[PDB]
From TrEMBL, chain A:
Region spans: Disordered: 1-17
Residues shown, of full length: 381 to 459 of 510
Record organism: Chaetomium thermophilum (strain DSM 1495 / CBS 144.50 / IMI 039719)
Coiled-coil regions listed in the entry: 24-68
Bias type Basic and acidic residues, positions: 1-13
Protein name as annotated: Nineteen complex-related protein 2-domain-containing protein
UniProtKB/TrEMBL annotation, chain B:
Name this protein carries in UniProt: G-patch domain-containing protein
Similarity comment: Belongs to the TFP11/STIP family.
Species, as recorded: Chaetomium thermophilum (strain DSM 1495 / CBS 144.50 / IMI 039719)
Range of the intact protein held here: 440 to 634 of 975
Coiled coil (UniProt feature): 9-36
Subcellular location: Nucleus
Length: 79, 195
């Protein structure tokens, strides 16, 4: 302990104290950034859900078109 | 066309699941940070002290701050606390304690009062201060000490040196009592200089 105390390399160079208001502002800024990231992820999830709904509507339309084509082919074959 | 729509829907569902997981994680982190900020604001806005003496009122305020910091450290899980948040809390505690220690050390006599009012809180929060932690020694550059450690070094070691110069050599019992009381939070450099 005494060797590290008296050591010119081991006696550390000092620096001043922090700012509590700046620390609180940094914490609040990190919280707001996390909230913005959550909002962006929620908007992306909503857009992906809308795209999935549009894809389901397109798949239903394609299935209806295929059923109509098959019914027309069956009617033509019967005629 | 149906296969293309199914592939697009599967990709959209995977993206939605990933975005929902990211949103849940970010919301949990934001809620934790908001709770930490609310606790910090509650600690920063404490009740007033009825002590008439300025030194006694500052000692009571420092004791209340140290008790609140110790309660917050006990409530927060060590495994659930991020290292960045821990360093921010330690720096904030150092900044809050340094002006109070500067205002109190002028009116504090280390010979008359070997043990201060907030010495127990300082001994409890020494783990948060980092004295109990092992030092981080580099290979080439000398490591600058902690903020609270360096502030304690400067102010407390200067006050202890002033007390050692002022006190009589023939009666070292009060100085030894002060050293024994404050030796828990005293860093090695300050202890070596005082010795």
């Amino acid at each position: 302990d005494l060797y590290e105390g008296r050591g010119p390399d081991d006696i550390p160079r000092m620096k001043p104290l922090p700012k509590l208001g700046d620390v609180l502002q940094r914490i609040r800024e990190a919280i707001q950034g996390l909230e913005g990231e959550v909002v962006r992820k929620r908007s992306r999830i909503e857009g992906l859900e809308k795209e999935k709904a549009e894809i389901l509507v397109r798949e239903k339309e394609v299935q209806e078109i295929l059923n109509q084509a098959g019914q027309k082919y069956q009617e033509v074959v019967g005629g | 066309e149906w296969q293309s729509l199914q592939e697009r829907k599967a990709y959209i569902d995977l993206q939605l699941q990933q975005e929902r997981q990211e949103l849940e994680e970010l919301e949990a982190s934001l809620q934790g940070n908001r709770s930490v900020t609310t606790a910090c604001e509650t600690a920063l806005r404490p009740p007033e002290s009825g002590e008439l003496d300025q030194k006694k009122d500052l000692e009571y305020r420092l004791e209340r701050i140290i008790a609140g910091l110790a309660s917050a450290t006990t409530s927060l899980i060590v495994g659930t606390m991020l290292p960045q948040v821990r360093d921010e809390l330690g720096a904030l505690a150092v900044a809050a304690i340094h002006p109070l220690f500067n205002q109190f050390r002028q009116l504090w006599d280390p010979l008359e009062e070997p043990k201060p009012s907030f010495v127990d809180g300082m001994k409890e929060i020494r783990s948060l201060l980092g004295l109990d932690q092992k030092p981080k020694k580099k290979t080439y550059r000398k490591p600058s000490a902690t903020p609270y450690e360096t502030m304690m070094y400067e102010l407390w070691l200067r006050t202890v040196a002033a007390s050692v110069r002022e006190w009589d050599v023939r009666e070292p019992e009060p100085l030894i009592a002060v050293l024994e009381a404050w030796d828990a939070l005293l860093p090695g450099f300050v202890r070596a200089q005082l010795l």
